[PDB]
Symmetry: C3
Subunit: 169 residues, 3 copies
Amino acid sequence: TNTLQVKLLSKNARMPERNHKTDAGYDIFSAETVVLEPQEKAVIKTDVAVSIPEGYVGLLTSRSGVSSKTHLVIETGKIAAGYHGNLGINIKNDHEDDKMQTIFLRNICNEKIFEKERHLYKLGSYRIEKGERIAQLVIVPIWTPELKQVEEFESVSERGEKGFGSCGV
Amino acid sequence: TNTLQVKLLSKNARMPERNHKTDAGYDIFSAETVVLEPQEKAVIKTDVAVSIPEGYVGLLTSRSGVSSKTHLVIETGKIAAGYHGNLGINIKNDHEDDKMQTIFLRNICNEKIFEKERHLYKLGSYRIEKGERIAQLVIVPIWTPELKQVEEFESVSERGEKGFGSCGV
Amino acid sequence: TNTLQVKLLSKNARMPERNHKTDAGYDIFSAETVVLEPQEKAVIKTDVAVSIPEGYVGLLTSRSGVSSKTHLVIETGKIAAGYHGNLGINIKNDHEDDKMQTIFLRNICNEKIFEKERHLYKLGSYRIEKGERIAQLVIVPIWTPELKQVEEFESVSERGEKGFGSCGV
Ligand SMILES: O=c1ccn([C@H]2C[C@H](O)[C@@H](COP(=O)(O)O)O2)c(=O)[nH]1
Ligand SMILES: O=c1ccn([C@H]2C[C@H](O)[C@@H](COP(=O)(O)O)O2)c(=O)[nH]1
Ligand SMILES: O=c1ccn([C@H]2C[C@H](O)[C@@H](COP(=O)(O)O)O2)c(=O)[nH]1
Ligand code: NI
Ligand code: NI
Protein backbone atom coordinates (compact mmCIF):
# COMPACT_ATOMS: atom_id res chain seq x y z
CA THR A 1 0.00 0.00 0.00
CA ASN A 2 0.99 3.64 -0.61
CA THR A 3 -0.78 5.46 2.25
CA LEU A 4 0.33 6.75 5.67
CA GLN A 5 -2.20 7.42 8.44
CA VAL A 6 -1.86 10.60 10.53
CA LYS A 7 -3.79 11.46 13.70
CA LEU A 8 -3.91 15.02 15.07
CA LEU A 9 -4.10 14.96 18.88
CA SER A 10 -5.06 18.62 19.43
CA LYS A 11 -6.01 21.88 17.68
CA ASN A 12 -2.38 22.97 18.24
CA ALA A 13 -1.22 20.16 15.94
CA ARG A 14 -0.19 20.89 12.35
CA MET A 15 -0.40 18.51 9.38
CA PRO A 16 3.01 17.34 8.07
CA GLU A 17 3.83 18.61 4.57
CA ARG A 18 5.64 17.11 1.60
CA ASN A 19 5.76 19.85 -1.03
CA HIS A 20 7.57 18.84 -4.25
CA LYS A 21 8.07 15.24 -5.42
CA THR A 22 11.83 15.84 -5.03
CA ASP A 23 11.70 16.30 -1.23
CA ALA A 24 13.01 13.51 1.01
CA GLY A 25 10.54 13.61 3.91
CA TYR A 26 7.77 15.45 5.74
CA ASP A 27 7.99 18.80 7.54
CA ILE A 28 7.23 18.54 11.26
CA PHE A 29 5.88 21.49 13.26
CA SER A 30 5.97 22.28 16.98
CA ALA A 31 2.70 22.32 18.93
CA GLU A 32 4.27 24.07 21.93
CA THR A 33 5.74 27.49 22.63
CA VAL A 34 8.87 26.89 24.70
CA VAL A 35 11.89 28.89 25.88
CA LEU A 36 15.12 26.89 26.14
CA GLU A 37 17.92 28.34 28.27
CA PRO A 38 21.59 27.43 27.65
CA GLN A 39 22.25 23.71 28.24
CA GLU A 40 18.53 22.98 28.83
CA LYS A 41 16.91 19.75 27.61
CA ALA A 42 13.28 19.12 26.63
CA VAL A 43 10.94 16.90 24.61
CA ILE A 44 8.79 19.14 22.41
CA LYS A 45 5.35 17.72 21.64
CA THR A 46 4.01 17.81 18.08
CA ASP A 47 0.55 16.47 19.03
CA VAL A 48 0.87 14.31 15.89
CA ALA A 49 0.48 10.52 15.72
CA VAL A 50 1.60 8.33 12.80
CA SER A 51 0.97 4.69 11.81
CA ILE A 52 4.12 3.37 10.13
CA PRO A 53 3.59 -0.14 8.67
CA GLU A 54 5.94 -3.08 9.33
CA GLY A 55 9.19 -3.22 7.35
CA TYR A 56 9.78 0.52 7.77
CA VAL A 57 11.22 2.98 10.31
CA GLY A 58 10.63 6.72 10.64
CA LEU A 59 13.53 9.11 11.20
CA LEU A 60 12.43 12.17 13.17
CA THR A 61 15.45 14.31 12.35
CA SER A 62 16.81 17.87 12.11
CA ARG A 63 16.71 20.36 9.23
CA SER A 64 19.68 22.25 7.75
CA GLY A 65 18.32 25.69 8.70
CA VAL A 66 17.70 25.31 12.43
CA SER A 67 20.73 23.08 13.13
CA SER A 68 23.30 25.17 11.20
CA LYS A 69 22.09 28.57 12.44
CA THR A 70 21.40 27.76 16.11
CA HIS A 71 22.82 25.64 18.94
CA LEU A 72 19.52 23.74 19.05
CA VAL A 73 20.50 20.08 18.69
CA ILE A 74 17.84 17.52 17.73
CA GLU A 75 18.61 13.85 18.39
CA THR A 76 17.26 11.71 15.53
CA GLY A 77 14.32 9.67 16.80
CA LYS A 78 13.78 6.14 15.51
CA ILE A 79 10.01 5.98 15.02
CA ALA A 80 9.10 2.29 15.26
CA ALA A 81 6.22 0.62 13.43
CA GLY A 82 3.09 0.46 15.58
CA TYR A 83 4.06 3.43 17.76
CA HIS A 84 0.84 5.46 17.67
CA GLY A 85 1.65 7.87 20.50
CA ASN A 86 2.64 11.54 20.38
CA LEU A 87 5.81 12.18 18.36
CA GLY A 88 8.29 14.06 20.55
CA ILE A 89 11.26 16.08 19.33
CA ASN A 90 14.30 15.16 21.45
CA ILE A 91 16.02 18.55 21.73
CA LYS A 92 18.84 20.29 23.61
CA ASN A 93 20.04 23.89 23.59
CA ASP A 94 23.78 23.24 23.36
CA HIS A 95 24.85 26.85 23.90
CA GLU A 96 27.33 27.14 26.78
CA ASP A 97 26.17 28.64 30.08
CA ASP A 98 28.55 31.62 30.28
CA LYS A 99 26.56 33.30 33.01
CA MET A 100 25.99 36.36 30.89
CA GLN A 101 22.71 38.27 30.48
CA THR A 102 20.93 39.90 27.53
CA ILE A 103 17.53 41.46 26.75
CA PHE A 104 17.15 39.54 23.47
CA LEU A 105 15.81 36.04 22.92
CA ARG A 106 16.92 34.23 19.76
CA ASN A 107 14.53 32.55 17.32
CA ILE A 108 15.01 29.24 15.46
CA CYS A 109 17.00 31.18 12.82
CA ASN A 110 19.34 32.86 15.37
CA GLU A 111 17.61 36.22 14.77
CA LYS A 112 17.07 38.52 17.76
CA ILE A 113 13.45 38.72 18.96
CA PHE A 114 12.41 42.34 19.54
CA GLU A 115 9.91 42.88 22.37
CA LYS A 116 7.85 45.86 23.53
CA GLU A 117 8.00 44.58 27.12
CA ARG A 118 11.61 44.45 28.37
CA HIS A 119 12.95 41.28 30.03
CA LEU A 120 16.34 39.88 31.08
CA TYR A 121 17.34 36.52 29.59
CA LYS A 122 20.44 34.34 29.84
CA LEU A 123 22.61 34.74 26.73
CA GLY A 124 22.16 31.80 24.34
CA SER A 125 18.45 31.30 25.04
CA TYR A 126 16.08 30.30 22.24
CA ARG A 127 12.31 30.39 21.79
CA ILE A 128 10.44 27.84 19.71
CA GLU A 129 7.03 29.21 18.70
CA LYS A 130 3.89 27.08 18.33
CA GLY A 131 3.50 26.14 14.66
CA GLU A 132 7.14 26.66 13.63
CA ARG A 133 8.82 24.22 11.24
CA ILE A 134 11.72 22.75 13.24
CA ALA A 135 11.99 19.08 12.23
CA GLN A 136 11.41 16.55 9.43
CA LEU A 137 10.36 12.89 9.17
CA VAL A 138 12.09 10.58 6.68
CA ILE A 139 10.78 7.01 6.41
CA VAL A 140 13.21 4.27 5.33
CA PRO A 141 12.72 0.48 4.91
CA ILE A 142 14.30 -1.88 7.46
CA TRP A 143 15.79 -5.38 7.40
CA THR A 144 14.87 -7.40 10.49
CA PRO A 145 16.12 -11.01 10.09
CA GLU A 146 16.31 -13.81 12.67
CA LEU A 147 19.48 -13.87 14.78
CA LYS A 148 21.85 -16.85 14.83
CA GLN A 149 24.71 -17.08 17.34
CA VAL A 150 27.93 -18.31 15.70
CA GLU A 151 31.50 -18.94 16.86
CA GLU A 152 32.89 -17.98 13.43
CA PHE A 153 31.35 -16.26 10.39
CA GLU A 154 30.62 -18.06 7.10
CA SER A 155 32.04 -15.40 4.76
CA VAL A 156 35.39 -13.85 5.71
CA SER A 157 35.63 -10.31 4.32
CA GLU A 158 38.46 -8.13 3.07
CA ARG A 159 37.76 -5.38 5.61
CA GLY A 160 37.71 -7.68 8.61
CA GLU A 161 38.23 -6.93 12.29
CA LYS A 162 39.40 -3.48 11.00
CA GLY A 163 38.95 -0.73 10.97
CA PHE A 164 37.47 1.36 13.76
CA GLY A 165 38.91 4.84 14.27
CA SER A 166 40.95 5.88 11.24
CA CYS A 167 41.83 9.57 10.88
CA GLY A 168 44.43 11.17 8.69
CA VAL A 169 44.51 8.94 5.67
CA THR B 1 18.52 -14.86 2.98
CA ASN B 2 16.79 -13.86 6.23
CA THR B 3 19.50 -14.54 8.84
CA LEU B 4 22.05 -12.37 10.66
CA GLN B 5 25.17 -13.88 12.25
CA VAL B 6 26.24 -12.70 15.72
CA LYS B 7 29.52 -13.52 17.49
CA LEU B 8 29.95 -12.97 21.24
CA LEU B 9 33.56 -12.00 22.02
CA SER B 10 33.45 -12.50 25.81
CA LYS B 11 31.30 -13.71 28.72
CA ASN B 12 30.54 -10.02 29.40
CA ALA B 13 28.75 -9.80 26.04
CA ARG B 14 24.96 -9.87 25.84
CA MET B 15 22.84 -11.13 22.94
CA PRO B 16 20.95 -8.37 21.05
CA GLU B 17 17.16 -8.57 21.43
CA ARG B 18 14.26 -7.85 19.10
CA ASN B 19 11.12 -8.35 21.17
CA HIS B 20 7.86 -7.69 19.27
CA LYS B 21 7.52 -7.81 15.47
CA THR B 22 6.68 -4.08 15.61
CA ASP B 23 10.14 -3.01 16.88
CA ALA B 24 12.53 -1.28 14.48
CA GLY B 25 15.89 -2.73 15.54
CA TYR B 26 17.91 -4.69 18.08
CA ASP B 27 18.70 -3.70 21.68
CA ILE B 28 22.44 -3.31 22.32
CA PHE B 29 23.96 -3.79 25.78
CA SER B 30 27.19 -2.51 27.32
CA ALA B 31 29.91 -5.02 28.22
CA GLU B 32 31.83 -2.50 30.33
CA THR B 33 31.23 -0.66 33.59
CA VAL B 34 32.43 2.91 33.02
CA VAL B 35 32.19 6.27 34.80
CA LEU B 36 32.01 9.28 32.47
CA GLU B 37 32.85 12.69 33.95
CA PRO B 38 31.47 15.92 32.43
CA GLN B 39 32.75 16.48 28.87
CA GLU B 40 34.51 13.07 28.80
CA LYS B 41 34.62 10.95 25.63
CA ALA B 42 34.87 7.16 25.31
CA VAL B 43 34.20 4.17 23.06
CA ILE B 44 32.21 1.61 25.05
CA LYS B 45 32.80 -1.99 23.98
CA THR B 46 29.85 -4.35 23.50
CA ASP B 47 32.03 -7.43 22.87
CA VAL B 48 29.55 -8.23 20.08
CA ALA B 49 30.42 -8.91 16.43
CA VAL B 50 27.93 -8.88 13.53
CA SER B 51 28.07 -10.03 9.89
CA ILE B 52 25.95 -7.63 7.83
CA PRO B 53 25.60 -8.82 4.19
CA GLU B 54 26.27 -6.59 1.16
CA GLY B 55 23.56 -4.11 0.16
CA TYR B 56 22.87 -3.17 3.79
CA VAL B 57 24.22 -0.86 6.51
CA GLY B 58 23.79 -1.07 10.28
CA LEU B 59 22.92 2.02 12.31
CA LEU B 60 24.31 1.78 15.85
CA THR B 61 22.18 4.54 17.33
CA SER B 62 20.71 6.01 20.53
CA ARG B 63 17.46 5.21 22.35
CA SER B 64 14.79 7.70 23.45
CA GLY B 65 15.21 6.93 27.17
CA VAL B 66 18.95 7.45 27.68
CA SER B 67 19.29 10.39 25.26
CA SER B 68 16.27 12.39 26.52
CA LYS B 69 16.93 11.85 30.24
CA THR B 70 20.73 12.26 30.33
CA HIS B 71 23.47 14.33 28.68
CA LEU B 72 24.97 11.09 27.31
CA VAL B 73 25.24 11.66 23.56
CA ILE B 74 25.72 8.67 21.25
CA GLU B 75 27.01 9.35 17.74
CA THR B 76 25.25 7.06 15.24
CA GLY B 77 27.76 4.51 13.94
CA LYS B 78 27.57 3.37 10.32
CA ILE B 79 28.21 -0.37 10.58
CA ALA B 80 29.58 -1.42 7.19
CA ALA B 81 29.10 -4.82 5.58
CA GLY B 82 32.01 -7.16 6.30
CA TYR B 83 33.04 -5.37 9.51
CA HIS B 84 33.36 -8.32 11.89
CA GLY B 85 35.18 -6.52 14.72
CA ASN B 86 33.90 -5.37 18.10
CA LEU B 87 30.98 -2.93 17.86
CA GLY B 88 31.86 0.22 19.80
CA ILE B 89 29.40 2.81 21.10
CA ASN B 90 30.75 6.28 20.24
CA ILE B 91 29.70 8.23 23.34
CA LYS B 92 30.23 11.60 25.04
CA ASN B 93 29.00 12.97 28.35
CA ASP B 94 27.90 16.42 27.16
CA HIS B 95 27.22 17.84 30.63
CA GLU B 96 29.13 21.10 31.18
CA ASP B 97 32.15 21.10 33.49
CA ASP B 98 30.94 23.62 36.09
CA LYS B 99 33.64 22.68 38.57
CA MET B 100 31.08 21.69 41.15
CA GLN B 101 31.15 18.59 43.36
CA THR B 102 28.51 16.11 44.56
CA ILE B 103 28.36 12.74 46.37
CA PHE B 104 25.89 11.26 43.87
CA LEU B 105 26.60 9.58 40.55
CA ARG B 106 23.80 9.55 37.98
CA ASN B 107 22.61 6.42 36.16
CA ILE B 108 21.55 6.09 32.49
CA CYS B 109 18.08 7.31 33.54
CA ASN B 110 19.38 10.41 35.39
CA GLU B 111 18.49 8.82 38.75
CA LYS B 112 20.86 9.37 41.68
CA ILE B 113 22.93 6.31 42.62
CA PHE B 114 22.89 5.74 46.39
CA GLU B 115 26.08 4.27 47.86
CA LYS B 116 27.01 2.87 51.27
CA GLU B 117 30.61 4.02 50.77
CA ARG B 118 30.80 7.81 50.42
CA HIS B 119 32.73 9.38 47.52
CA LEU B 120 33.09 12.83 45.92
CA TYR B 121 32.25 13.09 42.22
CA LYS B 122 32.15 15.97 39.74
CA LEU B 123 28.55 17.11 39.16
CA GLY B 124 27.18 15.75 35.88
CA SER B 125 28.99 12.41 36.05
CA TYR B 126 27.29 9.24 34.81
CA ARG B 127 27.91 5.53 35.32
CA ILE B 128 27.12 2.94 32.66
CA GLU B 129 26.81 -0.52 34.24
CA LYS B 130 27.86 -3.76 32.54
CA GLY B 131 24.79 -5.31 30.91
CA GLU B 132 22.69 -2.12 30.69
CA ARG B 133 20.59 -1.42 27.59
CA ILE B 134 22.00 1.84 26.19
CA ALA B 135 21.87 1.55 22.39
CA GLN B 136 20.06 -0.03 19.43
CA LEU B 137 20.99 -1.35 15.97
CA VAL B 138 18.77 -0.62 12.98
CA ILE B 139 19.75 -2.20 9.64
CA VAL B 140 18.73 -0.40 6.43
CA PRO B 141 19.40 -1.25 2.74
CA ILE B 142 21.90 0.87 0.78
CA TRP B 143 22.28 2.03 -2.82
CA THR B 144 25.90 1.96 -3.99
CA PRO B 145 26.05 2.78 -7.74
CA GLU B 146 29.08 3.55 -9.92
CA LEU B 147 30.17 7.20 -9.97
CA LYS B 148 30.28 9.28 -13.17
CA GLN B 149 31.86 12.74 -13.25
CA VAL B 150 29.74 15.21 -15.23
CA GLU B 151 29.97 18.92 -16.09
CA GLU B 152 26.16 19.26 -16.07
CA PHE B 153 23.35 16.99 -14.85
CA GLU B 154 20.93 15.17 -17.18
CA SER B 155 17.72 15.99 -15.30
CA VAL B 156 17.29 19.57 -14.06
CA SER B 157 15.06 19.61 -10.97
CA GLU B 158 12.58 22.06 -9.50
CA ARG B 159 14.47 22.36 -6.21
CA GLY B 160 17.82 23.07 -7.79
CA GLU B 161 20.92 24.73 -6.35
CA LYS B 162 18.55 25.68 -3.45
CA GLY B 163 17.97 25.43 -0.74
CA PHE B 164 20.48 25.02 2.09
CA GLY B 165 19.69 26.78 5.36
CA SER B 166 16.06 27.87 5.44
CA CYS B 167 14.58 28.84 8.82
CA GLY B 168 11.43 30.75 9.54
CA VAL B 169 9.14 29.76 6.73
CA THR C 1 19.72 2.63 -13.31
CA ASN C 2 22.98 2.05 -11.41
CA THR C 3 24.81 5.37 -11.89
CA LEU C 4 25.26 8.50 -9.75
CA GLN C 5 26.23 11.84 -11.30
CA VAL C 6 28.86 13.99 -9.57
CA LYS C 7 29.79 17.59 -10.44
CA LEU C 8 33.01 19.19 -9.17
CA LEU C 9 32.49 22.91 -8.56
CA SER C 10 36.16 23.93 -8.22
CA LYS C 11 39.76 22.69 -8.47
CA ASN C 12 39.71 22.42 -4.66
CA ALA C 13 37.03 19.72 -4.92
CA ARG C 14 37.93 16.05 -4.50
CA MET C 15 36.13 13.06 -6.05
CA PRO C 16 34.24 10.89 -3.52
CA GLU C 17 35.70 7.39 -3.12
CA ARG C 18 34.17 3.97 -2.52
CA ASN C 19 37.10 1.58 -2.14
CA HIS C 20 36.08 -2.05 -1.45
CA LYS C 21 32.68 -3.54 -2.33
CA THR C 22 32.14 -4.04 1.43
CA ASP C 23 32.09 -0.30 2.26
CA ALA C 24 28.77 1.36 3.09
CA GLY C 25 29.16 4.77 1.46
CA TYR C 26 31.44 7.34 -0.17
CA ASP C 27 34.31 9.25 1.44
CA ILE C 28 33.77 13.03 1.44
CA PHE C 29 36.67 15.49 1.50
CA SER C 30 36.89 19.12 2.63
CA ALA C 31 37.57 21.80 0.01
CA GLU C 32 38.38 24.44 2.64
CA THR C 33 41.13 24.99 5.19
CA VAL C 34 39.40 26.20 8.36
CA VAL C 35 40.29 26.74 12.02
CA LEU C 36 37.45 26.07 14.47
CA GLU C 37 37.76 27.55 17.96
CA PRO C 38 35.95 25.99 20.96
CA GLN C 39 32.14 26.15 20.56
CA GLU C 40 32.41 27.58 17.01
CA LYS C 41 29.96 26.57 14.27
CA ALA C 42 30.51 26.46 10.50
CA VAL C 43 29.34 24.93 7.22
CA ILE C 44 32.37 23.48 5.44
CA LYS C 45 32.09 23.47 1.65
CA THR C 46 33.04 20.36 -0.33
CA ASP C 47 32.60 22.03 -3.74
CA VAL C 48 30.90 18.77 -4.77
CA ALA C 49 27.43 18.44 -6.32
CA VAL C 50 25.43 15.19 -6.57
CA SER C 51 22.29 14.14 -8.47
CA ILE C 52 20.38 11.66 -6.30
CA PRO C 53 17.39 10.14 -8.17
CA GLU C 54 13.85 10.00 -6.75
CA GLY C 55 13.07 7.29 -4.19
CA TYR C 56 16.41 7.81 -2.42
CA VAL C 57 17.99 10.08 0.20
CA GLY C 58 21.67 10.80 0.86
CA LEU C 59 23.05 10.80 4.40
CA LEU C 60 26.00 13.18 4.74
CA THR C 61 27.30 11.79 8.01
CA SER C 62 30.33 11.47 10.31
CA ARG C 63 33.11 8.88 10.37
CA SER C 64 34.28 6.85 13.38
CA GLY C 65 37.80 8.33 13.37
CA VAL C 66 37.11 12.07 13.47
CA SER C 67 34.04 11.86 15.75
CA SER C 68 35.57 9.51 18.37
CA LYS C 69 38.97 11.23 18.54
CA THR C 70 37.90 14.89 18.44
CA HIS C 71 35.09 17.14 19.71
CA LEU C 72 34.19 17.92 16.08
CA VAL C 73 30.49 17.08 15.81
CA ILE C 74 28.94 16.63 12.35
CA GLU C 75 25.15 16.83 12.09
CA THR C 76 23.88 14.25 9.58
CA GLY C 77 22.59 16.06 6.50
CA LYS C 78 19.57 14.70 4.65
CA ILE C 79 20.54 15.13 1.00
CA ALA C 80 17.26 15.34 -0.92
CA ALA C 81 16.72 14.16 -4.49
CA GLY C 82 17.15 16.99 -7.00
CA TYR C 83 19.40 19.06 -4.73
CA HIS C 84 22.25 19.89 -7.11
CA GLY C 85 23.92 22.60 -5.02
CA ASN C 86 27.15 22.49 -3.01
CA LEU C 87 27.14 19.81 -0.31
CA GLY C 88 27.93 21.45 3.03
CA ILE C 89 29.20 19.69 6.15
CA ASN C 90 27.18 20.94 9.14
CA ILE C 91 29.87 21.02 11.82
CA LYS C 92 30.49 22.27 15.37
CA ASN C 93 33.57 22.20 17.58
CA ASP C 94 31.93 21.02 20.81
CA HIS C 95 35.00 21.53 23.01
CA GLU C 96 34.18 23.73 26.02
CA ASP C 97 35.48 27.31 26.10
CA ASP C 98 37.62 27.12 29.25
CA LYS C 99 39.40 30.37 28.50
CA MET C 100 42.75 28.66 28.44
CA GLN C 101 45.54 29.19 25.90
CA THR C 102 47.99 26.88 24.12
CA ILE C 103 50.53 27.06 21.27
CA PHE C 104 49.26 23.85 19.64
CA LEU C 105 46.40 23.40 17.21
CA ARG C 106 44.80 19.96 17.02
CA ASN C 107 44.20 18.06 13.77
CA ILE C 108 41.17 15.92 12.81
CA CYS C 109 42.83 13.02 14.69
CA ASN C 110 43.42 15.02 17.91
CA GLU C 111 47.18 15.10 17.20
CA LYS C 112 49.11 18.28 18.03
CA ILE C 113 50.14 20.32 14.99
CA PHE C 114 53.79 21.39 15.25
CA GLU C 115 54.62 24.77 13.69
CA LYS C 116 57.87 26.60 12.93
CA GLU C 117 56.11 29.94 13.45
CA ARG C 118 54.82 30.27 17.02
CA HIS C 119 51.20 31.33 17.66
CA LEU C 120 48.78 31.43 20.60
CA TYR C 121 45.51 29.52 20.19
CA LYS C 122 42.53 28.86 22.46
CA LEU C 123 42.73 25.34 23.94
CA GLY C 124 40.39 22.95 22.11
CA SER C 125 40.86 24.49 18.67
CA TYR C 126 40.95 22.29 15.57
CA ARG C 127 42.16 22.78 12.00
CA ILE C 128 40.54 21.05 9.04
CA GLU C 129 42.94 21.00 6.08
CA LYS C 130 41.85 21.26 2.43
CA GLY C 131 41.57 17.74 1.01
CA GLU C 132 41.18 15.90 4.33
CA ARG C 133 38.72 13.01 4.64
CA ILE C 134 36.23 14.14 7.31
CA ALA C 135 32.81 12.84 6.23
CA GLN C 136 30.95 10.11 4.33
CA LEU C 137 27.80 9.86 2.19
CA VAL C 138 25.47 6.87 2.56
CA ILE C 139 22.48 6.69 0.19
CA VAL C 140 19.34 4.86 1.39
CA PRO C 141 15.94 4.32 -0.31
CA ILE C 142 12.90 6.24 0.98
CA TRP C 143 9.17 5.58 1.29
CA THR C 144 7.08 8.66 0.48
CA PRO C 145 3.36 7.73 0.46
CA GLU C 146 0.30 9.99 0.32
CA LEU C 147 -0.94 11.25 3.70
CA LYS C 148 -4.44 10.53 5.01
CA GLN C 149 -5.81 12.24 8.13
CA VAL C 150 -7.66 9.79 10.39
CA GLU C 151 -9.41 10.00 13.76
CA GLU C 152 -8.42 6.41 14.61
CA PHE C 153 -5.94 3.96 13.07
CA GLU C 154 -6.99 0.83 11.14
CA SER C 155 -4.54 -1.60 12.77
CA VAL C 156 -4.14 -1.39 16.56
CA SER C 157 -0.66 -2.56 17.56
CA GLU C 158 0.80 -4.30 20.58
CA ARG C 159 3.26 -1.49 21.31
CA GLY C 160 0.68 1.27 21.20
CA GLU C 161 0.74 4.76 22.69
CA LYS C 162 3.87 3.45 24.55
CA GLY C 163 6.61 3.71 24.97
CA PHE C 164 8.63 6.92 24.82
CA GLY C 165 11.46 7.30 27.33
CA SER C 166 12.29 3.94 28.90
CA CYS C 167 15.60 3.63 30.75
CA GLY C 168 16.69 0.99 33.19
CA VAL C 169 14.97 -2.11 31.95
O1 LIG D 1 12.82 11.44 19.39
C1 LIG D 1 11.99 10.52 19.52
C2 LIG D 1 12.41 9.23 19.81
C3 LIG D 1 11.47 8.21 19.95
N1 LIG D 1 10.16 8.49 19.82
C4 LIG D 1 9.15 7.43 19.97
C5 LIG D 1 9.15 6.51 18.75
C6 LIG D 1 9.57 5.15 19.26
O2 LIG D 1 8.74 4.12 18.71
C7 LIG D 1 9.40 5.23 20.77
C8 LIG D 1 10.49 4.46 21.52
O3 LIG D 1 11.79 4.99 21.24
P1 LIG D 1 13.11 4.15 21.60
O4 LIG D 1 13.09 4.03 23.10
O5 LIG D 1 12.94 2.83 20.88
O6 LIG D 1 14.24 5.00 21.07
O7 LIG D 1 9.42 6.61 21.12
C9 LIG D 1 9.76 9.82 19.53
O8 LIG D 1 8.55 10.11 19.40
N2 LIG D 1 10.68 10.78 19.39
O1 LIG E 1 30.15 4.00 16.41
C1 LIG E 1 30.73 3.18 15.66
C2 LIG E 1 31.19 3.58 14.41
C3 LIG E 1 31.84 2.66 13.59
N1 LIG E 1 32.01 1.40 14.00
C4 LIG E 1 32.69 0.41 13.15
C5 LIG E 1 31.78 -0.02 12.00
C6 LIG E 1 32.47 0.44 10.74
O2 LIG E 1 32.44 -0.58 9.74
C7 LIG E 1 33.90 0.75 11.16
C8 LIG E 1 34.48 1.96 10.43
O3 LIG E 1 33.73 3.14 10.70
P1 LIG E 1 33.90 4.45 9.78
O4 LIG E 1 35.33 4.88 9.99
O5 LIG E 1 33.60 3.98 8.38
O6 LIG E 1 32.88 5.42 10.33
O7 LIG E 1 33.88 0.96 12.57
C9 LIG E 1 31.53 1.02 15.28
O8 LIG E 1 31.68 -0.15 15.70
N2 LIG E 1 30.91 1.91 16.07
O1 LIG F 1 24.34 19.05 6.20
C1 LIG F 1 23.68 19.32 5.17
C2 LIG F 1 22.29 19.40 5.23
C3 LIG F 1 21.57 19.70 4.08
N1 LIG F 1 22.22 19.91 2.92
C4 LIG F 1 21.47 20.23 1.69
C5 LIG F 1 20.77 18.99 1.15
C6 LIG F 1 19.29 19.29 1.24
O2 LIG F 1 18.62 18.89 0.04
C7 LIG F 1 19.20 20.80 1.43
C8 LIG F 1 18.07 21.21 2.36
O3 LIG F 1 18.25 20.66 3.67
P1 LIG F 1 17.03 20.62 4.72
O4 LIG F 1 16.72 22.08 4.98
O5 LIG F 1 15.92 19.88 4.00
O6 LIG F 1 17.59 19.89 5.91
O7 LIG F 1 20.47 21.22 1.93
C9 LIG F 1 23.64 19.82 2.89
O8 LIG F 1 24.27 20.01 1.82
N2 LIG F 1 24.32 19.53 4.00
NI1 NI G 1 21.08 9.31 11.55
NI1 NI H 1 28.33 20.96 24.60
